[PDB]
Design a protein around this nucleic acid. Sequence first.
RNA 1: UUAGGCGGCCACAGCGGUGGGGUUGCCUCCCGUACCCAUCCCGAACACGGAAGAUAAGCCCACCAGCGUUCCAGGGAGUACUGGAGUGCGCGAGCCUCUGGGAAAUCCGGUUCGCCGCCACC
RNA 2: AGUGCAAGAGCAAAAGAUGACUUGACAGUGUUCUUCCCAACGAGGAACGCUGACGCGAAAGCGUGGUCUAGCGAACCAAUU
RNA 3: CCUGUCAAACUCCAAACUUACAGACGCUGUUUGACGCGGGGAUUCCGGUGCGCGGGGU
Lengths: 140, 186, 95, 160, 154
Amino acid sequence: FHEMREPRIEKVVVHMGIGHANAEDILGEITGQMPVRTKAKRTVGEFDIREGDPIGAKVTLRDEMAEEFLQTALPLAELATSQFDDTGNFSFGLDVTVNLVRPGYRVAKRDKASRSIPTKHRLNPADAVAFIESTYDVEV
Amino acid sequence: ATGPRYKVPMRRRREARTDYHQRLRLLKSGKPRLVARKSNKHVRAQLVTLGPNGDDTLASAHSSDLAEYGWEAPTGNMPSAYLTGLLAGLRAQEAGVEEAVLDIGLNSPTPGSKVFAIQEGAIDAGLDIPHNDDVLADWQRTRGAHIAEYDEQLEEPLYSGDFDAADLPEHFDELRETLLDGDIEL
Amino acid sequence: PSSNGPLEGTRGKLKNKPRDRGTSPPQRAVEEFDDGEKVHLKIDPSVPNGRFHPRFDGQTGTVEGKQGDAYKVDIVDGGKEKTIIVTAAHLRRQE
Amino acid sequence: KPASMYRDIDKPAYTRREYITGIPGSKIAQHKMGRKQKDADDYPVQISLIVEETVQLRHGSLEASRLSANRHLIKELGEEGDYKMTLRKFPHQVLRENKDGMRAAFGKIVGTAARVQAGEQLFTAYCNVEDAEHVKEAFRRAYNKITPSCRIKVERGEEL
Amino acid sequence: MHALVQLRGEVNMHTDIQDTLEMLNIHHVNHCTLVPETDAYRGMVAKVNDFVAFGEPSQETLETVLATRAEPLEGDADVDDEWVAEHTDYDDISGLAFALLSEETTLREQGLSPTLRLHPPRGGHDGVKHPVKEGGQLGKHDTEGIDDLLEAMR
RNA sequence: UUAGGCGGCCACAGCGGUGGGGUUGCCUCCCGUACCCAUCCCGAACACGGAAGAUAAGCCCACCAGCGUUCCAGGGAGUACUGGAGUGCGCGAGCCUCUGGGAAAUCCGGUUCGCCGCCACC
RNA sequence: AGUGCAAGAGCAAAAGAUGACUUGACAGUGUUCUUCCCAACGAGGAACGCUGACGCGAAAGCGUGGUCUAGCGAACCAAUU
RNA sequence: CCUGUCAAACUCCAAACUUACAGACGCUGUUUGACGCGGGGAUUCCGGUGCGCGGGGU
Ligand SMILES: [Cl-]
Ligand SMILES: [Cl-]
Ligand SMILES: [Mg+2]
Ligand SMILES: [Mg+2]
Ligand SMILES: [Mg+2]
Ligand SMILES: [Mg+2]
Ligand SMILES: [Mg+2]
Ligand SMILES: [Mg+2]
Ligand SMILES: [Mg+2]
Ligand code: NA
Ligand code: NA
Ligand code: NA
Ligand code: NA
Ligand code: NA
Ligand code: NA
Ligand SMILES: [Sr+2]
Ligand SMILES: [Sr+2]
Ligand SMILES: [Sr+2]
Ligand SMILES: [Sr+2]
Ligand SMILES: [Sr+2]
Ligand SMILES: [Sr+2]
Ligand SMILES: [Sr+2]
Ligand SMILES: [Sr+2]
Ligand SMILES: [Sr+2]
């Protein structure tokens, strides 16, 4: 039981919201894999009329590429309670967010006969703090 | 769910198992659907005809009963898929079925995928199905060359139970061979 | 009326009841009829192509052959006989 | 104008404000009256006023009656007596007047009325067994300013 | 088996009603017909409910009438036992009368005109502006009432 | 159907919940990228190859009615409305009688936590 | 929500959004309905076929313009093929 | 939560009723030939009233 229930990270997204780019470089260096541009919707009085146009970038880290980045990422931040997602996710910031969830998650991300995860199998803020905390750092 | 004005999707759509929009286009041809479906360990290939209470299955072919003829290898690969196709293609040939349209379900039209490889077997069995040659995988990957040359990158057996270390795509030929036999109890 | 367009005053007849919203089943858009068969004309709001003139909803016609995949149903408007071209999606076998 | 012009029900229901404009505001100032914080069950007596014929009541009639009606209770029971009267109807029907000749006759919106089917309760008071006669007199006045004849019926009152 | 009797003229009566009457083989005021009792036959009388007098007659009366007002399919020949017997699968009026009521045959099936052309009610009827319940003569009747009329219209 | 594939009707099938279920069997989660294929960045997905592990999800099985829905009982109600008729009543708006039909809201009590088709299969 | 524009209607693994490819907004000839309920009447319109040629797709298939209902015009004369 | 009211251009509901086709009974037609088909000749295209349902207008 405990095994197929014990958490893990599915993806760590690093993103810089700018609004007009040259910032890609650093992420390619710090993560270890290419980045991707960010667009937007709706005109913005802040001279943000052009709808589809570069505004930021991001990178999704999976498996090692993710951990290896976290070993250094996590330390650089002071984690708090009000910094957690009801689904066991946390963002802090250059932004760095982490998507955590129990084993059989593919069930929802696949194509064929997918299904949403029962509120029970959903990770909890608590179960999140624990798992993470139990990996080189403190809570509170 | 919420109230009366609410709209609950057709069951088979909730379940996310049938793509009706695509289905319709299929159903139009009038020809029977050559249902091709995968599974982690298996591969099925049904030949469906339309009915008054629901679809009818005039001829199937499961990768499991593929061993029933002498298959000692796995049941979720190209060699597997092809064969299963040719098997159902034959059985169907035994029901009066002559043509069909490939129904790859919710799978993807990827080039050389097991589905097209399944479709290739039913064609070879004698059935008439609208296809696209250059979308099918190369005769070898159909055999198991892609996998055999993988065990070449040995150091650790490609398999658990011993079917063999280097694997025998020849076996593929051996089985295929056994199917073109008139006798063979279908 | 105020306009003499085909859909004039057809809000009611050409609209699905809430729970009948969205795409329709394919089983009946493929139904095969036989020449002579009596069929009930009723447009499927969810279906767009293969519709006969609204004025004919409720008519019970007799399939007298088909054109393409669509059917050529025979009906009688008042006293004048007409040949209506409709697709299965808008037909139901009588009885 | 005379109530004769809009007392019967003969036009189609006309209330879609989304299509009507220049609709005059209601002359009614209060539908809830008396001690509107208390409750209807807090009283022994509950006397309502029933309209005997189905009609239309222009807001000027409702207010005109409701006024002189309640104004009595305020007099005989004090501007803070122990009662609570209510006017359950509201002026929804919009009324027009064609004010030229019969050409392009559709009128211009001039008022609002409340359609009250015969046998319904226009008003409903809630008083203590004592002021029951001051409420009956409060209605005798009110039914003199609406078009139909009425009945003063007791909904809860064994005290007689 | 019911006795239908038109008591109201044709002028101003709806056409679909008058058409029904003629379908029930009744073409003039005071004409009478003996109609079975099926769903179909019910719908019709129901629809004519206002320009007719109906109900089930007593075997007795039905005879009194048949005697006095039945006619061949063509002719003056009086329909009397002899006549009845010489042409009808029966032996006498009572014989016929019983079948009609039991609903086994029809005046037509025998060679009798579907209509029994009665005579104005002697002493007048109870009026055509109200049903039987309101004291009039229109609508369904009491086997006794029906007779009272048919009797009076010998 | 000791867990499968394709369906028809498309909520009686929804929403929410409880309990049980898997050694070479099934479905999965799962393990892994040499290839076919793949991601405007990610073997996440898609695709391919494979079983060290698991029954915690999913799924299948049994059950729960609180919400939603289907049908039924009784009450509302033969009330509202209404096709036909009237030398019936009313100043009138309108009402009534006779005849043939006949709701809706709501309340209480049951039902409903899907049904059926073809194929494959200890 | 969006879907160019009135209103009513259709649409969610799409009819909406994004990407790419593409130009079927192609040639020609019909059936039917509409225009004109019933019931005769032109232009215009629509659905539905067939022949030829194309576009996309693995394929079924989809494209005779924009999801449906408005955006339209006789003869004579002129130009043009 | 509790409480007070509405809708020609609102609808989770919903008639009576009208209406397509078929069967049955009725009625009608096969010397009075219906149903239908072709042809000749019209008149007519100021209507009115009662009742039911209406829309406008005191
Ligand atoms: Cl599959
Ligand atoms: Cl049409
Ligand atoms: Mg309407
Ligand atoms: Mg005679
Ligand atoms: Mg006398
Ligand atoms: Mg008299
Ligand atoms: Mg369990
Ligand atoms: Mg009078
Ligand atoms: Mg020119
Ligand atoms: Na639908
Ligand atoms: Na003028
Ligand atoms: Na870009
Ligand atoms: Na499980
Ligand atoms: Na034309
Ligand atoms: Na005229
Ligand atoms: Sr009026
Ligand atoms: Sr003048
Ligand atoms: Sr008065
Ligand atoms: Sr993986
Ligand atoms: Sr008078
Ligand atoms: Sr008066
Ligand atoms: Sr009844
Ligand atoms: Sr279109
Ligand atoms: Sr009508």
